[PDB]
Scaffold this active site. Sequence first.
Site, PDB file in Angstrom:
ATOM      1  N   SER A 230      -0.521  11.741   2.740  1.00 22.44           N
ATOM      2  CA  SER A 230       0.650  12.560   2.988  1.00 22.44           C
ATOM      3  C   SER A 230       0.430  14.043   2.779  1.00 22.44           C
ATOM      4  CB  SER A 230       1.803  12.156   2.071  1.00 22.44           C
ATOM      5  OG  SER A 230       1.906  10.743   1.970  1.00 22.44           O
TER       6      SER A 230
HETATM    7  C1  LIG Z   1       2.139   9.549   2.605  1.00 23.60           C
HETATM    8  O1  LIG Z   1       1.000   9.172   2.425  1.00 23.60           O
HETATM    9  C2  LIG Z   1       3.413   8.730   2.401  1.00 23.60           C
HETATM   10  N1  LIG Z   1       3.094   7.297   2.456  1.00 23.60           N
HETATM   11  C3  LIG Z   1       2.638   6.656   1.383  1.00 23.60           C
HETATM   12  O2  LIG Z   1       2.521   7.235   0.329  1.00 23.60           O
HETATM   13  C4  LIG Z   1       2.310   5.179   1.519  1.00 23.60           C
HETATM   14  N2  LIG Z   1       2.366   4.297   0.527  1.00 23.60           N
HETATM   15  O3  LIG Z   1       2.749   4.699  -0.762  1.00 23.60           O
HETATM   16  C5  LIG Z   1       2.753   3.713  -1.800  1.00 23.60           C
HETATM   17  C6  LIG Z   1       1.943   4.819   2.889  1.00 23.60           C
HETATM   18  C7  LIG Z   1       0.684   4.636   3.344  1.00 23.60           C
HETATM   19  S1  LIG Z   1       0.773   4.271   5.053  1.00 23.60           S
HETATM   20  C8  LIG Z   1       2.533   4.419   5.031  1.00 23.60           C
HETATM   21  N3  LIG Z   1       3.275   4.246   6.165  1.00 23.60           N
HETATM   22  N4  LIG Z   1       2.961   4.695   3.809  1.00 23.60           N
HETATM   23  C9  LIG Z   1       4.115   9.354   1.132  1.00 23.60           C
HETATM   24  N5  LIG Z   1       3.305   9.803   0.057  1.00 23.60           N
HETATM   25  C10 LIG Z   1       3.783  10.085  -1.088  1.00 23.60           C
HETATM   26  C11 LIG Z   1       3.238  11.249  -1.892  1.00 23.60           C
HETATM   27  O4  LIG Z   1       2.316  10.934  -2.685  1.00 23.60           O
HETATM   28  O5  LIG Z   1       3.796  12.347  -1.689  1.00 23.60           O
HETATM   29  C12 LIG Z   1       4.763   9.333  -1.821  1.00 23.60           C
HETATM   30  C13 LIG Z   1       5.041   9.715  -3.072  1.00 23.60           C
HETATM   31  C14 LIG Z   1       5.052   7.990  -1.241  1.00 23.60           C
HETATM   32  S2  LIG Z   1       5.413   8.227   0.555  1.00 23.60           S
END
Ligand SMILES: *C(=O)[C@@H](NC(=O)/C(=N\OC)c1csc(N)n1)[C@@H]1N=C(C(=O)O)C(=C)CS1
Length: 634
Positions: free
Chosen positions: A346
């Site tokens: 992300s």
């Molecule tokens: C970005 O990577 C986004 N998604 C995730 O983090 C995912 N799983 O989290 C447990 C993911 C992988 S593939 C998909 N569709 N979702 C966001 N990232 C963050 C961050 O670290 O800022 C979040 C806190 C969770 S959502």
Amino acid sequence: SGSHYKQLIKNDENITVNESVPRGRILDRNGKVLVDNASKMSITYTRNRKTSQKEMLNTAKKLTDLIKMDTDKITERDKKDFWIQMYPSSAKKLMRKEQLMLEDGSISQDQFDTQLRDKIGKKQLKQLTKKDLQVLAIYREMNAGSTLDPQTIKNEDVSEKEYAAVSQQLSKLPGVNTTMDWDRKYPYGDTLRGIFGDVSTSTEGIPKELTEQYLSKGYSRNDRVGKSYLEYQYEDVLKGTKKQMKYTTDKSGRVISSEVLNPGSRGHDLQLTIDIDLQKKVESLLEKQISKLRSQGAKDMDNALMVVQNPKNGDILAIAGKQIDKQGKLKDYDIGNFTAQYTVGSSVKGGTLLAGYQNKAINVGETMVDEPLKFQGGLTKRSYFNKNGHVSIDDKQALMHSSNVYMFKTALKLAGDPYTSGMSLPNNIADAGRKLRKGLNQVGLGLKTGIDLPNETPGQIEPLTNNPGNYLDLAIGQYDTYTPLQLSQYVSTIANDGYRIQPHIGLSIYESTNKDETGPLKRKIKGNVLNKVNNSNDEIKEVQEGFKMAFNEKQGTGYASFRNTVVPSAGKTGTAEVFQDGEPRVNSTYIGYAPVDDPKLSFSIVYTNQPVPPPWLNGGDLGRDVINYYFKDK
Ligand SMILES: *C(=O)[C@@H](NC(=O)/C(=N\OC)c1csc(N)n1)[C@@H]1N=C(C(=O)O)C(=C)CS1
């Protein structure tokens, strides 16, 4: 002295020569020496098919006065045998009967002997003072192969007292030569050894691969060269110039005189951008933090890298990286920051936004609804922070929350096809991919960063034809993969208002000629500007604000690790889901800079294969700790 010699040109009775100097040193950015030459002397014997029995022990008896020896290689056999040599006295009195039998010709010599190097080991072996194992430890090494194989007698730890004494008596010592060579010396230890690289050892000469490229310039395979990384990369500066004469031959010997063409000269010294005191502290905190995270669940986590940069000019100030095994055994892996690639997640989003602004797909402060998207047939995507509700949000609150769906909507809007519930996915995203990957590229993501080392990878770049689902993932960091250095070049570009600068580690080159004195500056090694982003300064400040919000607003993802930095910090996180042996895992990334208002420090961090969180480990702490230590006094 000393200069293990290279070559002898030969025209019509005319000669030319060339000898080897020592290599440039390698210094940190405050002059602290990282890589030096140390001298290694070494005494050699040269045996003959025409000097057997005793003139061995005669050289060896003389030498066991000039040098002291390590007997850790002597063998009961050599002791046994040497006993016979040394005690024709008590030996003759051990084989009283056998002597006769040998003599009457009823046992052979073989048998006589084996019976003798069997007769003693108790009483009369303990008749060997320290004096004699000394002369044996030389004798032993004075034959292993026959012919003229110049066998080393003492290699390790040859004191300047010893090398002098015995170069001084080489006359009285038939068979004995002495050399001296230069070998790198690493005052700070393991630290950054993998980046410094290596030099072949003239035994090696040049190794099988790097040839051609080394020979198409003009080298001997006798020559020691630079086998990898920094030594490989600044070879032509860290190498010397060679000592070179030209001669006048006549008759069947005569040389009237020579004229010194090139006297010699040691390598130019190379100064790095590293700050070794920072470098060391980073390695420190890394480990404290790896151990901290393993004791909170992260026992499978298996890499952990960190780059630290000065974003206003590309200087790499620190660069660190461990591989972890299942029980914690660290291996150094500093090259990992630019030769390995990972799914980052992300934290590319600020670049995705900057691709939307460039292409009119969105514009600054455009707000949108974060909600579960529904696509045809039933596929759904959602933002983690909002699995079920509906929430309008800015771009800069998208960065603070790490909303995936604001980025999916941007991605679709960029593909001529704004979101509508139920919709089906454009079956051809080729030109959106190209546009979006070209936007990311502008901030470093997808390209080689330009670093002044070999083997930089630009990351795995799979194609974008008709895989819309991928195209979307690429806008939240989950398709193309990237090196931790690219992350660090990208966050730095945000931090210096849209200039993408070549990272460098080489900082300055020096004209050194005298020893240990530095000598005059020769060349600077600039971090060149690769490109400016195709964006308004109002677009860039939107992203910057989103990064600052992600670290300092109660709902920011990086609140609990960066809010109380000694100086204000800004940045962004990612948490990419991945799998390892079919179990569910996350990569976990951080990027940031400080101070928010005029950044002097930028960093990226990567951990791989942490647990999937209910419990949010806070591996950013390592990042907070580096910002705090760097800025301890302002
Ligand atoms: C970005 O990577 C986004 N998604 C995730 O983090 C995912 N799983 O989290 C447990 C993911 C992988 S593939 C998909 N569709 N979702 C966001 N990232 C963050 C961050 O670290 O800022 C979040 C806190 C969770 S959502």
